[PDB]
PDB file of C-alpha atoms in Angstrom:
ATOM      1  CA  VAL A  82     139.013 -94.256 106.518  1.00 28.86           C
ATOM      2  CA  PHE A  83     136.508 -95.978 108.804  1.00 27.75           C
ATOM      3  CA  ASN A  84     135.321 -93.229 111.169  1.00 27.46           C
ATOM      4  CA  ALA A  85     135.645 -90.230 108.832  1.00 28.66           C
ATOM      5  CA  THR A  86     132.773 -87.770 109.153  1.00 26.13           C
ATOM      6  CA  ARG A  87     131.818 -87.960 105.460  1.00 29.90           C
ATOM      7  CA  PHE A  88     133.052 -90.402 102.828  1.00 29.99           C
ATOM      8  CA  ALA A  89     133.401 -89.347  99.208  1.00 29.33           C
ATOM      9  CA  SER A  90     130.901 -90.444  96.583  1.00 28.75           C
ATOM     10  CA  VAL A  91     131.462 -93.597  94.556  1.00 29.73           C
ATOM     11  CA  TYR A  92     131.455 -91.342  91.481  1.00 30.20           C
ATOM     12  CA  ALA A  93     134.650 -89.713  92.794  1.00 31.40           C
ATOM     13  CA  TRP A  94     135.965 -92.078  95.472  1.00 27.42           C
ATOM     14  CA  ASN A  95     138.821 -90.856  97.650  1.00 27.81           C
ATOM     15  CA  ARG A  96     142.177 -92.579  97.123  1.00 28.04           C
ATOM     16  CA  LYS A  97     143.687 -93.044 100.589  1.00 30.15           C
ATOM     17  CA  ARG A  98     147.346 -93.996 101.050  1.00 26.54           C
ATOM     18  CA  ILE A  99     148.180 -95.986 104.194  1.00 28.30           C
ATOM     19  CA  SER A 100     151.897 -96.374 104.896  1.00 25.90           C
ATOM     20  CA  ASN A 101     154.484 -95.965 107.653  1.00 26.88           C
ATOM     21  CA  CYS A 102     151.936 -96.991 110.276  1.00 29.60           C
ATOM     22  CA  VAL A 103     150.785 -99.989 112.302  1.00 29.66           C
ATOM     23  CA  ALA A 104     147.657-101.613 110.854  1.00 26.32           C
ATOM     24  CA  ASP A 105     145.444-103.012 113.634  1.00 26.06           C
ATOM     25  CA  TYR A 106     142.090-104.357 112.429  1.00 26.37           C
ATOM     26  CA  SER A 107     141.306-106.110 115.729  1.00 27.87           C
ATOM     27  CA  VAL A 108     139.086-103.126 116.586  1.00 30.31           C
ATOM     28  CA  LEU A 109     136.415-104.606 114.307  1.00 31.32           C
ATOM     29  CA  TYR A 110     136.364-107.834 116.340  1.00 34.09           C
ATOM     30  CA  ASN A 111     136.996-105.950 119.604  1.00 32.43           C
ATOM     31  CA  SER A 112     133.731-104.002 119.207  1.00 32.25           C
ATOM     32  CA  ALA A 113     130.509-104.481 117.260  1.00 35.33           C
ATOM     33  CA  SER A 114     130.742-101.620 114.758  1.00 34.44           C
ATOM     34  CA  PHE A 115     130.231-102.957 111.223  1.00 36.37           C
ATOM     35  CA  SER A 116     127.470-105.404 110.328  1.00 39.58           C
ATOM     36  CA  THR A 117     129.142-106.778 107.178  1.00 37.18           C
ATOM     37  CA  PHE A 118     132.812-107.799 107.051  1.00 35.82           C
ATOM     38  CA  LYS A 119     134.374-110.220 104.570  1.00 34.20           C
ATOM     39  CA  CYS A 120     137.685-110.979 102.867  1.00 35.33           C
ATOM     40  CA  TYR A 121     138.502-112.684  99.564  1.00 34.69           C
ATOM     41  CA  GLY A 122     142.285-112.896  99.098  1.00 35.71           C
ATOM     42  CA  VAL A 123     143.158-113.186 102.798  1.00 38.24           C
ATOM     43  CA  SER A 124     141.661-114.222 106.145  1.00 38.20           C
ATOM     44  CA  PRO A 125     139.733-111.739 108.314  1.00 39.45           C
ATOM     45  CA  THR A 126     141.609-112.784 111.469  1.00 40.22           C
ATOM     46  CA  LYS A 127     145.088-113.085 109.902  1.00 40.61           C
ATOM     47  CA  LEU A 128     145.283-109.450 108.758  1.00 39.95           C
ATOM     48  CA  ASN A 129     147.216-108.503 111.900  1.00 40.23           C
ATOM     49  CA  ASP A 130     149.323-111.683 111.884  1.00 43.60           C
ATOM     50  CA  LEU A 131     150.487-111.094 108.300  1.00 44.17           C
ATOM     51  CA  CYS A 132     152.141-107.765 107.490  1.00 43.80           C
ATOM     52  CA  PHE A 133     151.734-106.148 104.072  1.00 42.69           C
ATOM     53  CA  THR A 134     153.927-103.704 102.161  1.00 39.58           C
ATOM     54  CA  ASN A 135     151.619-100.954 100.851  1.00 38.66           C
ATOM     55  CA  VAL A 136     147.984-100.834 102.003  1.00 40.45           C
ATOM     56  CA  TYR A 137     145.460 -98.662 100.160  1.00 39.18           C
ATOM     57  CA  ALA A 138     141.896 -97.903 101.250  1.00 37.01           C
ATOM     58  CA  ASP A 139     138.973 -96.977  98.992  1.00 37.14           C
ATOM     59  CA  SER A 140     135.971 -95.257 100.600  1.00 38.59           C
ATOM     60  CA  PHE A 141     132.600 -94.934  98.869  1.00 38.74           C
ATOM     61  CA  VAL A 142     128.879 -95.169  99.614  1.00 36.48           C
ATOM     62  CA  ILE A 143     126.378 -97.135  97.516  1.00 34.12           C
ATOM     63  CA  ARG A 144     122.839 -98.456  97.788  1.00 33.87           C
ATOM     64  CA  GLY A 145     122.230-101.508  99.946  1.00 33.89           C
ATOM     65  CA  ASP A 146     121.177-103.649  96.989  1.00 35.45           C
ATOM     66  CA  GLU A 147     124.423-102.613  95.249  1.00 35.09           C
ATOM     67  CA  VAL A 148     126.636-104.074  97.999  1.00 36.56           C
ATOM     68  CA  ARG A 149     126.174-107.664  96.808  1.00 32.79           C
ATOM     69  CA  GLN A 150     127.839-106.733  93.496  1.00 32.82           C
ATOM     70  CA  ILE A 151     130.954-105.260  95.165  1.00 32.36           C
ATOM     71  CA  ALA A 152     133.430-108.111  94.678  1.00 32.85           C
ATOM     72  CA  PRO A 153     136.071-109.292  92.176  1.00 33.04           C
ATOM     73  CA  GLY A 154     134.603-109.999  88.755  1.00 35.22           C
ATOM     74  CA  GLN A 155     131.190-108.554  89.601  1.00 33.46           C
ATOM     75  CA  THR A 156     129.066-106.684  87.065  1.00 29.98           C
ATOM     76  CA  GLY A 157     126.234-104.195  87.301  1.00 27.64           C
ATOM     77  CA  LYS A 158     125.449-100.497  87.245  1.00 28.61           C
ATOM     78  CA  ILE A 159     128.106 -99.855  89.937  1.00 27.67           C
ATOM     79  CA  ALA A 160     130.860-102.402  89.278  1.00 25.30           C
ATOM     80  CA  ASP A 161     131.274-101.602  85.575  1.00 26.02           C
ATOM     81  CA  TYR A 162     130.673 -97.824  85.568  1.00 27.78           C
ATOM     82  CA  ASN A 163     132.094 -95.954  88.575  1.00 25.80           C
ATOM     83  CA  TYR A 164     134.093 -98.377  90.757  1.00 24.46           C
ATOM     84  CA  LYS A 165     135.479-101.739  89.621  1.00 25.89           C
ATOM     85  CA  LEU A 166     137.571-104.408  91.336  1.00 25.72           C
ATOM     86  CA  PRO A 167     140.245-106.469  89.527  1.00 25.77           C
ATOM     87  CA  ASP A 168     139.379-110.098  88.884  1.00 26.30           C
ATOM     88  CA  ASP A 169     142.571-111.139  90.704  1.00 27.45           C
ATOM     89  CA  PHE A 170     141.936-108.497  93.383  1.00 25.59           C
ATOM     90  CA  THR A 171     143.532-109.296  96.750  1.00 26.19           C
ATOM     91  CA  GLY A 172     141.871-107.485  99.630  1.00 28.58           C
ATOM     92  CA  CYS A 173     138.851-107.173 101.888  1.00 29.57           C
ATOM     93  CA  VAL A 174     135.451-105.491 101.575  1.00 29.92           C
ATOM     94  CA  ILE A 175     133.914-103.699 104.566  1.00 31.17           C
ATOM     95  CA  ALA A 176     130.331-102.450 104.780  1.00 32.53           C
ATOM     96  CA  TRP A 177     128.113-101.125 107.560  1.00 33.84           C
ATOM     97  CA  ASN A 178     124.837 -99.250 108.013  1.00 36.34           C
TER      98      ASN A 178
ATOM     99  CA  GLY B 281     145.709-121.046  89.097  1.00 35.70           C
ATOM    100  CA  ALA B 282     146.264-120.179  92.760  1.00 38.58           C
ATOM    101  CA  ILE B 283     146.576-116.697  94.236  1.00 37.80           C
ATOM    102  CA  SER B 284     150.222-117.340  95.154  1.00 33.86           C
ATOM    103  CA  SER B 285     152.766-120.073  94.460  1.00 34.17           C
ATOM    104  CA  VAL B 286     154.004-120.183  98.083  1.00 36.10           C
ATOM    105  CA  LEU B 287     152.241-122.477 100.547  1.00 35.51           C
ATOM    106  CA  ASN B 288     153.366-120.333 103.486  1.00 36.71           C
ATOM    107  CA  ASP B 289     151.736-117.242 101.968  1.00 35.36           C
ATOM    108  CA  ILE B 290     148.451-119.120 101.507  1.00 36.62           C
ATOM    109  CA  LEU B 291     148.584-120.414 105.081  1.00 36.39           C
ATOM    110  CA  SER B 292     149.284-116.928 106.458  1.00 38.82           C
ATOM    111  CA  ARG B 293     146.647-115.284 104.217  1.00 38.88           C
ATOM    112  CA  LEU B 294     143.518-117.432 103.882  1.00 40.39           C
ATOM    113  CA  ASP B 295     141.346-119.300 106.359  1.00 41.26           C
ATOM    114  CA  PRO B 296     141.525-123.113 106.521  1.00 41.32           C
ATOM    115  CA  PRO B 297     138.646-123.493 104.029  1.00 44.40           C
ATOM    116  CA  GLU B 298     139.983-121.141 101.333  1.00 47.21           C
ATOM    117  CA  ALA B 299     143.613-121.921 102.165  1.00 49.31           C
ATOM    118  CA  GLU B 300     142.763-125.579 101.560  1.00 47.58           C
ATOM    119  CA  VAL B 301     141.268-124.754  98.147  1.00 48.08           C
ATOM    120  CA  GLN B 302     144.342-122.762  97.122  1.00 49.51           C
ATOM    121  CA  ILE B 303     146.689-125.472  98.407  1.00 48.74           C
ATOM    122  CA  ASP B 304     144.608-128.050  96.531  1.00 50.42           C
ATOM    123  CA  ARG B 305     145.061-126.087  93.306  1.00 47.65           C
ATOM    124  CA  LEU B 306     148.808-125.833  93.932  1.00 47.98           C
ATOM    125  CA  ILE B 307     149.017-129.549  94.749  1.00 50.10           C
ATOM    126  CA  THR B 308     147.112-130.440  91.581  1.00 52.04           C
ATOM    127  CA  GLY B 309     149.439-128.343  89.437  1.00 53.91           C
ATOM    128  CA  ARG B 310     152.645-129.542  91.089  1.00 52.52           C
ATOM    129  CA  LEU B 311     151.472-133.166  91.025  1.00 46.69           C
ATOM    130  CA  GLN B 312     150.681-132.929  87.318  1.00 45.99           C
ATOM    131  CA  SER B 313     154.144-131.452  86.764  1.00 45.90           C
ATOM    132  CA  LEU B 314     155.779-134.198  88.839  1.00 45.37           C
ATOM    133  CA  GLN B 315     153.822-136.941  87.064  1.00 44.63           C
ATOM    134  CA  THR B 316     154.881-135.562  83.683  1.00 45.62           C
ATOM    135  CA  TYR B 317     158.480-135.360  84.919  1.00 48.10           C
ATOM    136  CA  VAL B 318     158.353-138.951  86.182  1.00 49.51           C
ATOM    137  CA  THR B 319     156.838-140.243  82.935  1.00 49.30           C
ATOM    138  CA  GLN B 320     159.459-138.465  80.828  1.00 48.72           C
ATOM    139  CA  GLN B 321     162.228-139.686  83.143  1.00 46.80           C
ATOM    140  CA  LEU B 322     160.917-143.249  82.834  1.00 45.62           C
ATOM    141  CA  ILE B 323     160.926-142.927  79.041  1.00 48.86           C
ATOM    142  CA  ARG B 324     164.497-141.615  79.163  1.00 48.76           C
ATOM    143  CA  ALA B 325     165.359-144.493  81.502  1.00 47.29           C
ATOM    144  CA  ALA B 326     163.941-146.978  78.994  1.00 48.84           C
ATOM    145  CA  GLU B 327     166.093-145.374  76.302  1.00 52.30           C
ATOM    146  CA  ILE B 328     169.129-145.538  78.605  1.00 51.72           C
ATOM    147  CA  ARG B 329     168.354-149.193  79.355  1.00 49.95           C
TER     148      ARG B 329
ATOM    149  CA  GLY C 165     133.394-130.987  82.612  1.00 50.06           C
ATOM    150  CA  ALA C 166     132.872-127.352  81.615  1.00 49.41           C
ATOM    151  CA  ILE C 167     129.595-125.718  80.620  1.00 44.67           C
ATOM    152  CA  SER C 168     130.782-125.416  77.008  1.00 43.48           C
ATOM    153  CA  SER C 169     133.729-126.538  74.891  1.00 44.93           C
ATOM    154  CA  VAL C 170     134.179-123.142  73.166  1.00 43.50           C
ATOM    155  CA  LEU C 171     136.120-120.377  74.902  1.00 44.19           C
ATOM    156  CA  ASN C 172     134.237-117.665  72.999  1.00 44.67           C
ATOM    157  CA  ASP C 173     130.850-119.081  74.032  1.00 46.47           C
ATOM    158  CA  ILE C 174     131.918-119.137  77.692  1.00 50.99           C
ATOM    159  CA  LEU C 175     133.228-115.572  77.479  1.00 50.97           C
ATOM    160  CA  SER C 176     130.028-114.310  75.844  1.00 55.26           C
ATOM    161  CA  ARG C 177     127.605-116.193  78.099  1.00 54.24           C
ATOM    162  CA  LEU C 178     129.382-116.204  81.474  1.00 50.37           C
ATOM    163  CA  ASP C 179     130.661-113.338  83.596  1.00 53.14           C
ATOM    164  CA  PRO C 180     134.432-112.852  83.995  1.00 52.71           C
ATOM    165  CA  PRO C 181     134.598-114.758  87.305  1.00 54.01           C
ATOM    166  CA  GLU C 182     132.624-117.846  86.243  1.00 54.99           C
ATOM    167  CA  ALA C 183     134.058-117.599  82.726  1.00 57.10           C
ATOM    168  CA  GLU C 184     137.529-117.809  84.273  1.00 57.67           C
ATOM    169  CA  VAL C 185     136.591-120.969  86.191  1.00 58.74           C
ATOM    170  CA  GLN C 186     135.117-122.610  83.092  1.00 61.31           C
ATOM    171  CA  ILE C 187     138.137-121.617  80.985  1.00 61.39           C
ATOM    172  CA  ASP C 188     140.410-123.037  83.682  1.00 57.50           C
ATOM    173  CA  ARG C 189     138.494-126.322  83.522  1.00 59.00           C
ATOM    174  CA  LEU C 190     138.792-126.387  79.726  1.00 64.39           C
ATOM    175  CA  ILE C 191     142.512-125.601  79.918  1.00 68.71           C
ATOM    176  CA  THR C 192     143.041-128.337  82.505  1.00 72.94           C
ATOM    177  CA  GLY C 193     141.237-130.929  80.402  1.00 73.28           C
ATOM    178  CA  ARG C 194     143.087-129.911  77.246  1.00 72.23           C
ATOM    179  CA  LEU C 195     146.346-130.072  79.206  1.00 69.75           C
ATOM    180  CA  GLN C 196     145.751-133.678  80.225  1.00 66.63           C
ATOM    181  CA  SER C 197     144.753-134.319  76.600  1.00 65.69           C
ATOM    182  CA  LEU C 198     148.091-132.909  75.421  1.00 67.13           C
ATOM    183  CA  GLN C 199     149.929-134.864  78.120  1.00 67.51           C
ATOM    184  CA  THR C 200     148.294-138.124  77.015  1.00 65.89           C
ATOM    185  CA  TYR C 201     149.082-137.354  73.373  1.00 68.38           C
ATOM    186  CA  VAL C 202     152.714-136.575  74.211  1.00 69.23           C
ATOM    187  CA  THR C 203     153.086-139.708  76.342  1.00 64.01           C
ATOM    188  CA  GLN C 204     151.655-141.884  73.568  1.00 59.60           C
ATOM    189  CA  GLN C 205     153.888-140.196  70.986  1.00 60.68           C
ATOM    190  CA  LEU C 206     156.964-140.669  73.182  1.00 55.31           C
ATOM    191  CA  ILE C 207     156.198-144.347  73.802  1.00 54.63           C
ATOM    192  CA  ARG C 208     155.577-144.998  70.106  1.00 54.08           C
ATOM    193  CA  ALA C 209     158.761-143.066  69.309  1.00 54.04           C
ATOM    194  CA  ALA C 210     160.759-145.224  71.726  1.00 51.70           C
ATOM    195  CA  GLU C 211     159.348-148.320  70.035  1.00 51.34           C
ATOM    196  CA  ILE C 212     160.166-146.868  66.606  1.00 45.91           C
ATOM    197  CA  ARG C 213     163.672-145.977  67.819  1.00 42.77           C
TER     198      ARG C 213
ATOM    199  CA  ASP D 282     116.343-141.443 102.041  1.00 42.15           C
ATOM    200  CA  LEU D 283     119.705-141.485 103.832  1.00 41.71           C
ATOM    201  CA  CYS D 284     119.531-142.772 107.409  1.00 41.03           C
ATOM    202  CA  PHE D 285     122.116-141.572 109.920  1.00 41.20           C
ATOM    203  CA  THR D 286     123.819-143.323 112.829  1.00 38.45           C
ATOM    204  CA  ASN D 287     123.471-140.752 115.637  1.00 40.22           C
ATOM    205  CA  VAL D 288     121.772-137.359 115.307  1.00 38.80           C
ATOM    206  CA  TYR D 289     122.552-134.440 117.625  1.00 40.79           C
ATOM    207  CA  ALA D 290     120.655-131.145 117.404  1.00 38.15           C
ATOM    208  CA  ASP D 291     122.241-127.904 118.640  1.00 38.24           C
ATOM    209  CA  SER D 292     119.565-125.282 119.335  1.00 38.72           C
ATOM    210  CA  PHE D 293     120.684-121.689 119.872  1.00 36.03           C
ATOM    211  CA  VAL D 294     119.476-118.136 119.273  1.00 38.95           C
ATOM    212  CA  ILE D 295     121.715-115.454 117.756  1.00 41.29           C
ATOM    213  CA  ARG D 296     121.370-111.948 116.365  1.00 39.68           C
ATOM    214  CA  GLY D 297     119.437-111.557 113.134  1.00 41.75           C
ATOM    215  CA  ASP D 298     122.496-110.550 111.110  1.00 41.92           C
ATOM    216  CA  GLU D 299     124.599-113.438 112.489  1.00 43.09           C
ATOM    217  CA  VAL D 300     122.576-116.209 110.810  1.00 42.74           C
ATOM    218  CA  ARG D 301     124.374-115.841 107.468  1.00 38.87           C
ATOM    219  CA  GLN D 302     127.674-116.541 109.268  1.00 38.87           C
ATOM    220  CA  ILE D 303     126.516-119.905 110.685  1.00 43.10           C
ATOM    221  CA  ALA D 304     127.987-122.466 108.281  1.00 44.86           C
ATOM    222  CA  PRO D 305     131.183-124.505 107.765  1.00 44.73           C
ATOM    223  CA  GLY D 306     134.142-122.269 106.991  1.00 46.83           C
ATOM    224  CA  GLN D 307     132.268-119.015 107.602  1.00 42.90           C
ATOM    225  CA  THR D 308     133.730-116.180 109.667  1.00 40.74           C
ATOM    226  CA  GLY D 309     132.093-113.946 112.236  1.00 43.35           C
ATOM    227  CA  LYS D 310     131.768-113.123 115.903  1.00 45.20           C
ATOM    228  CA  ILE D 311     129.742-116.183 116.915  1.00 48.31           C
ATOM    229  CA  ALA D 312     131.304-118.437 114.277  1.00 47.18           C
ATOM    230  CA  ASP D 313     134.890-117.572 115.205  1.00 46.64           C
ATOM    231  CA  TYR D 314     134.560-117.213 118.995  1.00 49.49           C
ATOM    232  CA  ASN D 315     131.392-118.657 120.535  1.00 45.22           C
ATOM    233  CA  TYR D 316     129.947-121.434 118.347  1.00 48.11           C
ATOM    234  CA  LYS D 317     131.954-122.838 115.433  1.00 49.38           C
ATOM    235  CA  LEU D 318     131.113-125.548 112.913  1.00 46.63           C
ATOM    236  CA  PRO D 319     133.790-127.995 111.685  1.00 47.71           C
ATOM    237  CA  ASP D 320     135.197-127.113 108.276  1.00 49.78           C
ATOM    238  CA  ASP D 321     134.500-130.648 107.018  1.00 49.32           C
ATOM    239  CA  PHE D 322     131.177-130.717 108.891  1.00 49.02           C
ATOM    240  CA  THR D 323     128.414-132.825 107.331  1.00 49.55           C
ATOM    241  CA  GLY D 324     124.940-131.586 108.185  1.00 51.71           C
ATOM    242  CA  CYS D 325     122.253-128.976 107.630  1.00 53.34           C
ATOM    243  CA  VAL D 326     121.533-125.486 108.959  1.00 52.07           C
ATOM    244  CA  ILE D 327     117.954-124.444 109.756  1.00 56.73           C
ATOM    245  CA  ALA D 328     116.718-121.017 110.833  1.00 55.97           C
ATOM    246  CA  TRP D 329     113.418-119.154 111.065  1.00 56.55           C
ATOM    247  CA  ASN D 330     111.933-115.923 112.407  1.00 58.55           C
TER     248      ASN D 330
END
């Protein structure tokens, strides 16, 4: 999901199923890997404290200027055509160079 | 209007800033409900009086 | 307190996220309007009873 | 126009990408661990190259 050799295109973004495993996101704060890291429906530091039921990861690559429009309710040539997020979306968005 | 109707879920999910906004929305809604309930109960109490 | 008093105008002009906030404001205001109307009607109905 | 009681300036240098995370309620390495601003903090943030 994070360290895969090659992510799929946003045109056909891989649908990854994460289940029956321990989710530990402290690696992001335990090492400087990703420049951009933000959450909307939850807290970045409480992901490990709070346990979810079914976690799903979406991997895609877009232009740098197109990152700002990757969020719930956003519109543009990426949000409304290939990949869209629900307005009530609950999750986090991760980006790095 | 909040993400969830449970204060514990908001506390365990969002940071103090956003958790406070969600809890404020929940408090506003529940306080409006309680004020309406109290007003209607006072009207019923006037009728009972 | 919203940008406009028409839901259709907000939907057409504003994006879904900001349109949702404005529609929530309009709904909230109209809800206190309805609450005030109902309270006045109930008080007048108690007097008329 | 508004005159303050006591003014304290905190001068520090951080990584270029960490400036956007320096504000009340924001999250990040420096913000969360090293230097944090109060959530209800009243003040201004100034940065330059």
